[PDB]
Symmetry: D2
Subunit: 287 residues, 4 copies
């Protein structure tokens, strides 16, 4: 009978920006995919179509490019400027969500202005402003890893639907997707990203795995124990199955050498590793 | 300084199931992409690699196929059976999240056992159990719609970065992605899905749009007002830009006929239309 | 020692065009993905960077939109116009390849100007011009089909690497990818496309399959036998495996009802069905 | 008026193989996506469903894994083994087409058995056997490159649809997709691939580009001039547009710093650079 407008947000998504720094002959490249969405009083926009409060998504896009002209130290510093601009520039805009994917480039043979894409991972950043409060979540994704041994899986309950054989030697392969929330915007964003990346990789490789859940816990633990500015880190790790092919029918054996890398289905293990005492449900993990 | 395991879940993702009903010559097809994840006490599994509580993702997979043998009336009913099985079959399992995508098939010229895929839309369903609480969210995605007229956008503020020209006649194109939460399990799931689909399409097409926001509001309003079993519906609608090409440099006019369909960037308008008084932030939305 | 520039072509690829017909209240929609590439004397452009013969890809793009203004009955007609324009307008351009994907839209409840995308198939057209000769190849792709029965596979040879079991009842699923070459440009393109589509579907569903190769042959034969204007048709059909899941480990049988739809690998059966006497290797197929 | 079976081939496509070498604690990883297709006398299989000559695609799949058990020096040599096996092991099999994609992995901190994927490029190999002739085409794809300067485009004709302005400073970005045909199978496949990759990147980066066509020509020339075993190299280079954003309406200049990286459309420049006097129509290119 009675209808109400709940949570809502709008903006320009996937604004592909490439910023070249060339004050000198040694060019630098920053490559981003930016998304900007505003939150505030947009009641009349939805109920009557009154756009008095609707800062056009096209305008939001223009602002991204206009601000890029001044340059930015890091992706997070750039998002901070955008959110500050919109929340403060319009009285009816009380906050928003600004995010970006950062793509890496490597110089071609150390050339001053020629590069190739490093597609092995994608860095992410998300800024959320709610009135007087703001929070930043950084992350990494698309980083595929694999252990050819040093992985086990046994001791699991065996019910009517269980057929999986226990094993003390299997391949452990996953795609590293992690996102961590900072407890302060006063961070050396680039240095921490590199550190976290190394910690996750190290924990994955050096942990003798008794389960993907265990490996993930150790990856998240290393990060929390190492960075005081991080209150928690969330991870979503698929278990990309590599089946040891049965070669007995061909008169052969398969000593953990020949595998069939299956696409789907896959295991999906997810968890939040956090610093004792920190809040368990920050708003930034929603909408 | 103390590290602690927070929210977590695990299971098998994207189990592709095709169920054929052939007790009669008139074969029927049910096509799903199922994901199953459990929640409960998995503390030891993460901190010590003790898998006593870890129902193998392989087992969860086997269960999906075994349960499909008995058949199911709807996707939601199928997910309900899985959720009850795991939560009740294991004491340390207190809940979880079971989701599925349903793909449609049409008979080839009414053939008894030959079909073609209807890729114009994908139906979704998600069941979440938390203790004694159960919640179901159904939805639709991948349904692309377009209005060649009956759309306007003007009256928006103009700042230093605004260059967009007001208009009273433009193309409005989007991909309908909607999800609605049921307030009861006593629902004719297939009947409501077909009805909601028709209501979203009807509202999109018949509403003289003054803004995508207004169109989205009308689509949601229609659903809430028609179905007592729905407490809220969320929508994420991209505004897929179709630019009117300027042919004047060539001495030709373009009476809203020739357009360039851009990929990115795109506007992204999202909102929640709720039944007045209903829950503000159900946990099923955060996953 | 001696390097030579061989075959070459260049142009603008994937120009997204949406042409709306609104002479009256009953709007029509034509949605294309156009690619234009030229062939001729571009020796100096490659070897010396002399761009005198290089009609800019940007110009080719503009030409596509400029020609769209005048409208067009069929996709093939539109491509013919482009080919004629470039070959005759520049003396050093001796030929080219113009291609397009045509996307289908359906009216929303018979609305005058509101539509929904029919994503169940994509139509293709390719025009190649060489000197004074031209050829057109039309096609269909993305049309997924499945037979729940009426498919067998037995009688194949067995070697030491053979483990497949014979069967008289299996699911046969594929993606219909077919392309056919017209032996004249005087064709009712839209009518032949609709007919061919129908013939392929009929042969697929109605042929009791003893092999994917056999079904494909029948599909091709139906087309050649029905349309005099078609000299040959090439098909590429993957065999989308739907494995009958083994439920015996769970105490159940599986009477051809529960299947696992695997992604990869997949069988890939390809063939050219030709009209006795027609050309054996027309250049359009190579590119 | 009669129907004839023309060219045809069939087999198993995209067989995902991971071969782990673990003779010592220093594990090695070989990751391939293999496709196997046979050619020969399959007339009866198509016209009558007689499968006597049809070596099951499932059998072809099995052979891939069985052969992997013995290990292989390079991707090309693995394909050669498969091709010879099928062509020599079946009288009605006169040839075929075997191809593979090779995915690269890097050790994590020089770890003995932990690796991460290098997704910056994918290596390819295609082998076609016809009687006693064995033809191999190696290649690379997915290698995105970009020059921030050192690229110009001017001197092109300005026809009636030309609006593009001349420029002496622009970004040149492309996806390096190249394939070269060896004139002998006696090649150090890994060494030549590494050399070719280096030469393409070197020519792309150091050539002051007056056009994408020129840059492509220099890339191919370098390969042909350096490797006697290569008869020709074909490249398909998209011109991925990075449009210099006009910030003048916002009161700012933009000294080649802020760009909009567009998705579509894109220029597509392609050409074959051959060794003078070599075969210009090898069958392997038709596929
Ligand atoms: O590390 C694992 N965790 C699981 O929950 C699981 N389930 C499974 O089948 N294999 C694995 N492996
Ligand atoms: O319906 C619209 N809403 C917006 O917020 C917007 N912004 C924009 O540029 N075009 C539109 N259209
Ligand atoms: O290097 C180029 N070659 C072209 O053929 C072309 N066309 C165009 O618009 N830009 C470019 N650039
Ligand atoms: O119709 C088929 N053709 C094949 O060549 C083949 N190979 C296979 O394993 N199954 C099938 N099915």
């Amino acid at each position: 009978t009675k209808v109400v407008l709940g949570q809502n947000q709008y903006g320009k998504a996937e604004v592909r920006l490439v910023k070249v720094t060339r004050n000198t002959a040694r060019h630098e490249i920053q490559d981003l995919n930016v998304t900007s969405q505003l939150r505030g009083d947009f009641e009349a926009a939805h109920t009557a179509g009154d756009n008095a409060h609707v800062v056009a998504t096209d305008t939001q896009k223009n602002t991204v490019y206009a601000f890029a002209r001044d340059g930015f130290a890091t992706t997070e510093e750039f998002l901070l400027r955008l959110g500050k601009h919109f929340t403060e520039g319009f009285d009816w805009v009380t906050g928003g969500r600004w995010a970006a994917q950062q793509f890496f480039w490597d110089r071609i043979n150390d050339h001053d202005h020629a590069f190739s894409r490093n597609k092995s991972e994608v860095r992410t950043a998300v800024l959320e402003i709610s009135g007087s409060e703001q929070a930043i979540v950084a992350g990494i994704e698309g980083l595929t890893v694999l252990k050819s041994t040093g992985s086990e899986f046994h001791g699991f309950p065996r019910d009517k639907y269980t057929t999986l054989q226990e094993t003390t030697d299997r391949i452990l392969a996953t795609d590293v997707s992690a996102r961590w929330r900072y407890n302060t915007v006063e961070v050396d964003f680039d240095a921490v990203y590199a550190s976290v990346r190394g910690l996750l990789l190290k924990a994955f490789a050096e942990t003798h795995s008794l389960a993907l859940q265990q490996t993930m816990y150790e990856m998240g633990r290393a990060v929390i124990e190492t960075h005081p500015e991080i209150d928690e880190i969330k991870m979503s790790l698929p278990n990309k199955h590599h089946f040891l092919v049965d070669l007995q029918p061909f008169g052969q054996d398969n000593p953990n050498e020949v595998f069939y890398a299956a696409d789907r289905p896959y295991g999906l293990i997810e968890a939040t590793i956090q610093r004792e005492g920190s809040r368990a449900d920050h708003p930034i993990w929603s909408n």
